[PDB]
Amino acid sequence: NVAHGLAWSYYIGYLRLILPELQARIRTYNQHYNAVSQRLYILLPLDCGVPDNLSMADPNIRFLDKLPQQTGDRAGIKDRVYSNSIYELLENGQRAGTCVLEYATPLQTLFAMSQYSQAGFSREDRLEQAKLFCRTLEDILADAPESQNNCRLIAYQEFSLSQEVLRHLRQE
């Protein structure tokens, strides 16, 4: 039942930190360039497949630009860098959306853990850990004060990813 601690690491070490600074960072892209949506869209695939090149998972998802970096001194590292990537979502060759898009990196840790033998985590426990992680996250982000209209969880299991993201975007 390792996912529960990974959900909290994900909040306490990242989301808690970048969400506050997020809308201010997005305004600055919109005003030093042309536009972009005001939430962090976090992809939770339940098969825990997390490719590194978002566009390699779907062509209709194309990288456009990096947001302005965030920096902070964290646990000895001077100027540690949180970066986020802006993606354009196409549909029938028309671009129908723009947002900050990314996977939930903890899901990568979960996949890896299920191959390494001394991690004591079976291959089959993956899908239920993925669900317990999405669930524990969702609890957190509901009560999260840092979280007020600034990120949207996108969990799914398998298909069009571009269509699946366009779904949530078209809801506000």
Ligand X SMILES: Nc1nc2c(ncn2[C@@H]2O[C@@H]3COP(=O)(O)O[C@H]4[C@@H](F)[C@H](n5cnc6c(N)ncnc65)O[C@@H]4COP(=O)(O)O[C@@H]2[C@@H]3O)c(=O)[nH]1
Residue 91, binding choice from ligand X, a copy of itself, none, Cβ under 5 to 8 Å by partner class = none
When computed from its CA atoms, the radius of gyration of the chain, rounded to whole angstroms, is 16
State which of positions 30-49 bind ligand X (CB under 6 A).
none
82 binds ligand X (CB under 6 A): yes
Q: Is 122 in the site for a copy of itself (CB under 8 A)?
A: no
Distance, CA of 135 to CA of 129 (rounded, Å):
10
Q: Which of positions 105-144 make contact with ligand X (CB under 6 A)?
A: 105-106, 109
Which spans of this chain sit near a copy of itself (rule: CB under 8 A)?
Answer: 2-6, 8-9, 12-13, 43, 50-54, 63, 66, 69, 72-81, 83-85, 87, 101-109, 112-113, 116, 118-120, 139-140, 143
Provide the binding-site residues for ligand X, judged by CB under 6 A: 9-10, 13-14, 77, 80, 82, 102, 105-106, 109
